[PDB]
Design a protein around this ligand. Structure first.
Ligand SMILES: CCCCCC/C=C/CCCCCCCCCC(=O)O[C@H](COC(=O)CCCCCCCCCCCCCCC)COP(=O)(O)OC[C@@H](O)CO
Ligand SMILES: CCCCCC/C=C\CCCCCCCCCC(=O)O[C@H](COC(=O)CCCCCCCCCCCCCCC)COP(=O)(O)OC[C@@H](O)CO
Ligand SMILES: CCCCCC/C=C\CCCCCCCCCC(=O)O[C@H](COC(=O)CCCCCCCCCCCCCCC)COP(=O)(O)OC[C@@H](O)CO
Ligand SMILES: CCCCCC/C=C\CCCCCCCCCC(=O)O[C@H](COC(=O)CCCCCCCCCCCCCCC)COP(=O)(O)OC[C@@H](O)CO
Ligand SMILES: CCCCCC/C=C\CCCCCCCCCC(=O)O[C@H](COC(=O)CCCCCCCCCCCCCCC)COP(=O)(O)OC[C@@H](O)CO
Ligand SMILES: CCCCCC/C=C\CCCCCCCCCC(=O)O[C@H](COC(=O)CCCCCCCCCCCCCCC)COP(=O)(O)OC[C@@H](O)CO
Lengths: 256, 191, 191, 52
C-alpha cells in the first residue's frame, strides 16, 4: 500500500486547502473599507473586465450563429419556424450565456489573476509589504476579488445580447424568417423576472467561485517558477468543475 | 497518521470502482435482468411499428418487454414472442387458492350441475392439479393488440382482460389478437 | 515507465468500451446486415421524402433496405431499387413443396382444368419447374407504396400482398405502386 | 481523464433535466434519448471537451 497511502495523503491536503481558502474569504468580506480603496477597484475593473471584452464579444457572436443555424433545421420540419427567436433567446438566457461565459472567464481573467498575485509572492513584494505594516490581503487581494464579482455578470449580459443579435442575423437575414414574428414570439414567451434575472443570479454565483479560486491559488502558491505554472492550471480545472457542478443544482431549483 | 492516509486512500478507490460498476448497470450493458420472467407468444396480422424491447401493459402498468418479431413467409403472419413477470402476473400462494375456489364454485353451479354427471367434484379434483402448475393471470378469452401510446407515442402491446374461467399456462399462445391500424388505411376506411 | 505504459493501456480499454457503446447501443449499425439479399426495383410517381437506407416492410416486419432513387427522364417516373433478404422472404425445402402442389391445384381445379387442351400435366409440370429457380414470397399482384410511420415520422416502403397465383422471380419489377400522400394529396381525396 | 469524465456526467444531467421539460408539453417524452444523444454527438461533446 505505497500509492494508496499517497492517494489518501493527497485528498487530505486538498480538504485542508478548502479550510484555508474559506478563512481567507471571511477575512476579506468582513472588514472595514479603507482609504484609497475605490480607486484601486476601478483600476482592477480595467484589468479583469475591459481586457476580457474582446474574447467575450466574439465568442458570443459565434455561438449565436450556430444556434440560429441548428435551431432552424429542427423547427422547420414541424411547422414552427416562428418560434426561432424563442428558442434562441431561451437557450442563451438560461443555459449557455451563464455557463460558456464563465468558462472563458476562468481561462483568461481567472488564470491571469493567479499569475499576477503569484509573481508578487515570488519576487517578495508581498513579504516586503507586510513588514512595512500594510496587510497585503487588503491592499492587493481585496480589490482583485471585488473586480471579478462585478465584471462577470456584466459580461454575460453582453454575451447574451450579441448571441441574440447573431442568431437574428442568420435566421432572419439569411434563412428568411419573418422579422416581426421573430421579435413578437420572443416578447411573448420570455419573461424578465423568470428568464433574464435568473440568468444574472447564476452568473453572480459563478463569479464568486471563479474569482475566489483564482485569488486563493496565487496567494497560497509555491514561489518557484514552475510552482506558479502549476497553480495557473489549477484555477482552470477547479473553476470549470465548479461551474458545471453548480449549474445542475441551479437549474433544478429555477427551472425544475 | 499513516493509518489515516490509508483509510482515505481506500475509501476513494472503493467509491471510484463502485461508480464504475453502477455506470455499467444503468447503461444497458451487462446485467438488465427480470423477476423470474417466463415467455409467452402471439401471432398478429400487422405489427407495423413494433420494435423489440418494447413495452407490454395490462391496465396501464408495464408487466413485461418484447423479445423478438419474425415473419412466416407461407402464411403472411407475424409471430411476436414476449416475456412477462412473476411478481405482477402470477399468484403467490394465497390468491392461488382464491381463484381456485371462484372458478370451482362458478363451474359447479346449477347450470352445469344438470349438464355434467351427478358424480361431480371429480372434475374439481382433476382441474385443480392442472391449475397449480405454472398458471398466469391472463384468462382464456383475453386479447392482445398493438397500441400507439397517445397520439405521437412509439408502439407497444396491450393485454385487455375479460371474462375467463380457465387461464393460460406459462409458455402458451394468446389466440385472440388484432393488429395495428395504418393511417393510410384509416383515411381510406373513412372515405 | 512500467506504470506509465500500464496506465496508457487502461486509457485504450476505456476508449474501446465507449466506442462499443456508441456503435452498438446508440446507433443503428449492428442491425444492418442482410442475409444473401437479392435486389428488386419499382417505379413510382412521387417519392418525396424517401431517403436512401430507408426501410421495407411486409406485415410490419422489416425485410430490406432502399439503395438508390433516380429519375429516368425519358419516362419521368422515379425508379427505386431495393434489396430484400434470403430468410424472411424466400422459401425453403418444405415450403416450396407446400406451394408447388397448391399452384397445380389452384391451376388444375374444377375451374381451370378444361381451359387448356386435353393434354396431360407435363405442361402443368412445366408450371412446377418454372417455379423453384429463384422464387420469392411476393406474388404478382402485390403492390408497394410509400408510407409514413406515425404522422411526423420518416417514410418507408410497404409491401401489401393480395390474391394471385404465380410468384415473382428474384430481380423482377413490382408493377403496382402508389406514391406518397402529402397534404395536398390528402385534401383532394376528401373532396 | 478525471476532468473530462466528471464534466461529461454533469452536462448530461442538465440535458436530461432540461430536455424533459420541453418535450413533456408536446407529448413527445419518448424522444428524450434522441435529443440527448444528438445534442452531445454533434454539438456539445466536440466543443466543451475541447474547451477543457
Ligand atoms: C414551481 C415554482 C416555480 C418558480 C417560481 C419563481 C418565479 C420566478 C421569480 C423569481 C425567481 C426565483 C427562483 C429561485 C431563485 C434561486 C435563489 C438562489 O439560487 O439563491 C442563491 C444560492 O446560491 C447557492 O448558494 C448555490 C446554492 C443553491 C441551493 C439554494 C436552495 C434555494 C432554496 C430557496 C430558494 C426558494 C425558491 C423559490 C422558487 C419557488 C443565491 O443567489 P445570490 O443572491 O446571487 O447570492 C450570491 C451568492 O454568492 C451567495 O452569497
Ligand atoms: C445583500 C448585502 C449586500 C451584498 C453583499 C453580501 C456580501 C457580504 C457583505 C459585503 C459588504 C460588507 C462591507 C465590507 C466590505 C469589505 C471589503 C472592503 O472593505 O474592501 C475595501 C475596498 O473598497 C470596496 O469596498 C470595493 C469598493 C466597492 C466594490 C463594489 C462597487 C459597487 C458598484 C457595483 C454595484 C452593482 C449595482 C448595480 C445594479 C444595476 C477596502 O479595501 P482596501 O482599501 O484596498 O484596503 C487597503 C488597506 O486596508 C491597506 O492597504
Ligand atoms: C444591441 C447589441 C448589444 C451589443 C453591444 C456591443 C458589444 C460591444 C462592442 C464592441 C466591443 C469591442 C471590444 C473592444 C476591445 C477593447 C480592448 C482594449 O481597449 O484594451 C486595450 C488593448 O487592446 C488590445 O490589446 C488590442 C486588442 C487586439 C486588437 C484586435 C486585433 C484583431 C482585429 C484585426 C483583424 C480584423 C478581423 C478579421 C475580420 C475579417 C488597452 O491597451 P493596453 O496597452 O493593454 O492597456 C493600457 C493601460 O495600461 C492604460 O490604458
Ligand atoms: C416544439 C415547440 C416547443 C417550443 C420550442 C422552443 O422554442 O424551444 C425552447 C427551448 O428553450 C428552452 O427553454 C430549453 C432551453 C435550454 C435548451 C438546452 C440547453 C443547451 C445546453 C444544455 C445544458 C448544457 C449547458 C451548456 C454547456 C456549456 C423552449 O420553448 P417553449 O417550449 O415554448 O418554452 C420553454 C419553457 O416554457 C419550458 O418549456
Ligand atoms: C458505457 C459508458 C462508458 C464510460 C466508460 C467509463 C468512463 C471512465 C471511468 C472512470 C475514469 C476514472 C478516472 C481515473 C483517473 C486516473 C488518473 C491517474 O491515474 O493519474 C494518477 C494521479 O491521479 C491523481 O492525481 C489522483 C487524482 C485525484 C484523485 C481524485 C480525488 C477526488 C475523489 C475523492 C472525493 C470523493 C468524491 C465525492 C463523492 C461524494 C497518476 O499519478 P501521478 O503521480 O500524477 O503520475 C505518476 C507517473 O509519474 C508514473 O506513474
Ligand atoms: C419535436 C420534433 C423534433 C425532434 C425532437 C428532437 O429529437 O430533438 C433534436 C434536437 O437536437 C438535434 O438533433 C439538433 C442537434 C443539435 C441541437 C443544437 C446544438 C445544441 C448547442 C447549440 C450550439 C452551442 C455551441 C456549443 C456549446 C458551447 C432534433 O432531432 P430531430 O428533430 O428528431 O431530427 C433528427 C435529425 O434528422 C435532425 O433533425
Amino acid at each position: 500500500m505505497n500509492t494508496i497511502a499517497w492517494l489518501g495523503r493527497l485528498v487530505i491536503e486538498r480538504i485542508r486547502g478548502i479550510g484555508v481558502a474559506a478563512l481567507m474569504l471571511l477575512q476579506i468580506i468582513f472588514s472595514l473599507p479603507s482609504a484609497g480603496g475605490f480607486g484601486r477597484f476601478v483600476y482592477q475593473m480595467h484589468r479583469v473586465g475591459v481586457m476580457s471584452l474582446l474574447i467575450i464579444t466574439v465568442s458570443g457572436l459565434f455561438i449565436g450563429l450556430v444556434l440560429g443555424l441548428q435551431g432552424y433545421s429542427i423547427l422547420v420540419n414541424v411547422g414552427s419556424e416562428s418560434m426561432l427567436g424563442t428558442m434562441v433567446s431561451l437557450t442563451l438566457l438560461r443555459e449557455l450565456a451563464p455557463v460558456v461565459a464563465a468558462l472563458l472567464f476562468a481561462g483568461r481573467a481567472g488564470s491571469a489573476l493567479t499569475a499576477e498575485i503569484g509573481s508578487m509572492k515570488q519576487s517578495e513584494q508581498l513579504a516586503s509589504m507586510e513588514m512595512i505594516g500594510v496587510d497585503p490581503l487588503k491592499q492587493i487581494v481585496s480589490p482583485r476579488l471585488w473586480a471579478g464579482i462585478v465584471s462577470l455578470p456584466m459580461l454575460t449580459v453582453i454575451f447574451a445580447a450579441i448571441g441574440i443579435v447573431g442568431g437574428k442575423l442568420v435566421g432572419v437575414d439569411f434563412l428568411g424568417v419573418d422579422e416581426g414574428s421573430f421579435w413578437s414570439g420572443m416578447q411573448n414567451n420570455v419573461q424578465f423576472g423568470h428568464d433574464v434575472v435568473n440568468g444574472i443570479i447564476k452568473s453572480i454565483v459563478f463569479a464568486l467561485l471563479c474569482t475566489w479560486i483564482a485569488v486563493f491559488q496565487g496567494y497560497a502558491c509555491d514561489p518557484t517558477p514552475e510552482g506558479i505554472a502549476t497553480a495557473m492550471t489549477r484555477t482552470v480545472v477547479y473553476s470549470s468543475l465548479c461551474v458545471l457542478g453548480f449549474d445542475f443544482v441551479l437549474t433544478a431549483v429555477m427551472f425544475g | 497518521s499513516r493509518t489515516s492516509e490509508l483509510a482515505v486512500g481506500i475509501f476513494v478507490i472503493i467509491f471510484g470502482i463502485a461508480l464504475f460498476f453502477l455506470a455499467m448497470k444503468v447503461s444497458g450493458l451487462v446485467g438488465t435482468n427480470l423477476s423470474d420472467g417466463y415467455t409467452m407468444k402471439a401471432q398478429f396480422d400487422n405489427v407495423n411499428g413494433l420494435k423489440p424491447r418494447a413495452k407490454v401493459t395490462m391496465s396501464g402498468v408495464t408487466i413485461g418487454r418484447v423479445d423478438s418479431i419474425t415473419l412466416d413467409p407461407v402464411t403472411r403472419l407475424a409471430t411476436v414472442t414476449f416475456d412477462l413477470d412473476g411478481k405482477l402476473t402470477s399468484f403467490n400462494a394465497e390468491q392461488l387458492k382464491e381463484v381456485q375456489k371462484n372458478a370451482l364454485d362458478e363451474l359447479r353451479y346449477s347450470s352445469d350441475y344438470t349438464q355434467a354427471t351427478p358424480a361431480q367434484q371429480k372434475t374439481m379434483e382433476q382441474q385443480l392439479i392442472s391449475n397449480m402448475n405454472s398458471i398466469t393471470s391472463i384468462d382464456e378469452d383475453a386479447y392482445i393488440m398493438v397500441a400507439t401510446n397517445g397520439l405521437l407515442g412509439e408502439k407497444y402491446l396491450k393485454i385487455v382482460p375479460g371474462g375467463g374461467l380457465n387461464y393460460l399456462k406459462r409458455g402458451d399462445t394468446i389466440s385472440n389478437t388484432q393488429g395495428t391500424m395504418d393511417l393510410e388505411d384509416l383515411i381510406s376506411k373513412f372515405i
